[PDB]
Write a protein that binds this ligand. Structure first.
Ligand code: MG
Ligand code: MG
Ligand code: MG
Lengths: 81, 175, 79, 114
RNA sequence: GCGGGGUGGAGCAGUCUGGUAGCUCGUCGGGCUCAUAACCCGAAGGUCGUAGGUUCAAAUCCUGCCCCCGCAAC
RNA sequence: CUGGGCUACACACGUGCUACAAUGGAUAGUACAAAGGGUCGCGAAGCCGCGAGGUGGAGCUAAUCCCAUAAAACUAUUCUCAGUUCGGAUUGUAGGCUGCAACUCGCCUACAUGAAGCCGGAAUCGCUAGUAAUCGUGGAUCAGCAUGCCACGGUGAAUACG
């Protein structure tokens, strides 16, 4: 959300990420969510985000908080003609 | 003679009580400093020396000699005898003043000055650095420098090894 | 040294205008100022910004750890 | 003059607009913090006036520092590897904007025929 | 082995006199046309076979190699 | 059913919007329209907020009330013919709405940046009168999303030998 009434994050992702404090980051979390923000709580745990055909991994950082998950998982594969 | 006074006052006794010399003349001294630009651009333009020479003489306090090529090289488009860079030898009062100015004023003026490499030793006991960009010195303005270039600074010593050299320069204030 | 060849080089007093650290040494630049430091002599005054007396590598250097970046900003904006 | 040699003939507001980081309303706010007349000319200034204006400016963010700031912001999303920064790196629109046609100030001038 | 040559896609200059990329046809794009051609408007395309030299600088002057067309030899 | 694509991007064409400025721009004050829509919809006054908007709930199933300051025009001051206070892209940060949700992929605002462009090759298009040109307005679709579409009035020409 663009507004102070937010933030937004999918409950089905926030819950799994909160359970993933005891993950130890050996495992990985798949989501079909590209609309959900990144909280700092997502840091460290790689997320496999569904671009349309596959789940592409992203490693969260302090620097990619504030943004969405889809910004790190492109939809349209293009190679300079 | 701030730093010469300092030297003969404090560092010679300190340094000789450290390294345990058999006499007062084994103790290291700085023989000289040697500043050198290293210009290669002068193959294609004469104004570059006209900048660098005046600029070293301002940075340094005595005219530099334009050094020339000992041999001809085609990979640099370089004929023998061409003027390549200039140099200055500073000794005595003026090398001491140059180090004074250097550590006091100009070394901190560098972008992210966290000292300088302690490993940069020739192995015989002398030290060399290079000022990347001559505007670091105060005698010269930035508004006069058409284009920046660096220069090697050699601090030559009578020291027989890296250890003695480093301690000399640490006591004089080189980080 | 010769005559006429070298540029005007004279004893000049630097002063760090961060903390008024005074220091004599030779140079070739007035900065349009003069003082009589170290009584018995006139010396021009080549004022300057930060010196070795104040540089953080020669002194304290932990400063400027101001923010972690985007994280406190998120948490400050949304609680 | 005021961070850079602004025009002497221009009025003070327009003069301050020629600082990378400052436009007309910031200029009005600054000259109102100074209490000066904004309709006056720039060669017609005074020195103490000018110095107060410099103070208010240096309170406002520095020109070159602003350049460094925006470039750091861009470097960040280039160096992560987000979509938005791939657009910055590829030279294309970053907003949600169309590229089949009308993308000239990003792609550059008209490239060679395919 | 002896002569010519090797320069945008084709044919030809320019080399002798070092700084200069040219003429005609063609190609691409846009117009005219119901469409193609012709015509009109713009533009691209050559590091001068190649590897080295000389020169401040080489299509150009010097050297070796590699190719094509002829003529000989076989 | 979720997520993506129809919004891709070396490039070509059409149709349009914005401009390339002084018959103009910034700022202030300020006169005169028509045609339309509105029930869970229009949403007032007052207030907070630079602003987008928020709050509030009056009145209205409407020639009653609202959307709705009409803008160009005019008057004053300034800019003085300059890549400019032109132009407004593109980009960074921060806001607001809508909607479960605004990365892909909405619109709008604030600040800053300030791009190309100093009147358009060969060619080619509409128009004979309240027309062309120009300025705003409304409606539909629609939660939101228009330079597009259909209607509205304001100002208001030149020319037609043949
Ligand atoms: Mg040539
Ligand atoms: Mg479509
Ligand atoms: Mg007729």
């Amino acid at each position: 959300r663009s507004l102070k009434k937010g933030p937004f994050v999918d409950d089905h992702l926030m819950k799994k990420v909160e359970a993933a404090a005891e993950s130890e980051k050996k495992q990985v979390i798949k989501t079909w969510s590209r609309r959900s923000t990144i909280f700092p709580t997502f840091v460290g745990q790689t997320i496999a985000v569904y671009d349309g055909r596959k789940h592409v991994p992203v490693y969260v950082q302090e620097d990619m908080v504030g943004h969405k998950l889809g910004e790190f998982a492109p939809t349209r594969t293009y190679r300079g003609h | 003679n701030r730093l010469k006074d300092q030297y003969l006052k404090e560092i010679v006794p300190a340094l000789m009580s450290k390294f345990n010399y058999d006499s007062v003349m084994e103790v290291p001294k700085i023989d000289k400093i040697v500043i050198n630009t290293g210009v290669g651009d002068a193959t294609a333009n004469a104004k570059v020396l006209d900048s660098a020479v005046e600029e070293l003489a301002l940075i340094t306090g005595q005219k530099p000699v334009i050094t020339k090529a000992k041999n001809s090289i085609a990979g640099f488009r370089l004929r023998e005898g061409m003027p390549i860079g200039a140099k200055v030898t500073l000794r005595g009062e003026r090398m001491y003043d140059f180090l004074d100015k250097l550590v006091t004023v100009s070394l901190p003026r560098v972008r992210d000055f966290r000292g300088v490499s302690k490993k940069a030793f020739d192995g015989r006991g002398n030290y060399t650095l290079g000022v990347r960009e001559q505007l670091i010195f105060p005698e010269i303005d930035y508004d006069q420098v058409s284009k920046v270039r660096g220069m090697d600074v050699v601090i030559v010593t009578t020291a027989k090894s890296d250890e003695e050299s480093h301690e000399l320069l640490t006591q004089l204030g080189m980080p | 040294m010769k005559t006429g060849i070298h540029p005007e080089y004279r004893p000049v007093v630097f002063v760090d205008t961060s903390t008024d650290f005074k220091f004599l040494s030779g140079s070739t630049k007035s900065s349009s100022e003069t003082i009589k430091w170290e009584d018995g002599n006139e010396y021009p005054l080549l004022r300057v910004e930060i010196s070795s007396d104040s540089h953080p590598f020669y002194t304290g250097k932990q400063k400027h750890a101001t923010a972690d970046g985007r994280v406190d900003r998120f948490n400050k904006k949304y609680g | 003059i005021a961070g850079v040699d602004v025009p002497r003939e221009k009025r003070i507001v327009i003069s301050l607009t020629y600082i990378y980081g400052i436009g007309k309303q910031t200029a009005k706010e600054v000259l109102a913090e100074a209490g000066v007349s904004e309709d006056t000319r720039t060669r017609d200034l005074t020195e103490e006036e000018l110095g107060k204006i410099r103070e208010i400016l240096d309170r406002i963010k520095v020109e070159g520092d602003l350049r460094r700031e925006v470039n750091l912001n861009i470097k960040r999303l280039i160096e992560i590897g987000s979509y938005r920064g791939m657009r910055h790196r590829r030279g294309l629109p970053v907003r949600g904007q169309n590229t089949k046609n009308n993308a000239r100030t990003r792609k550059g001038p008209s490239k060679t025929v395919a």
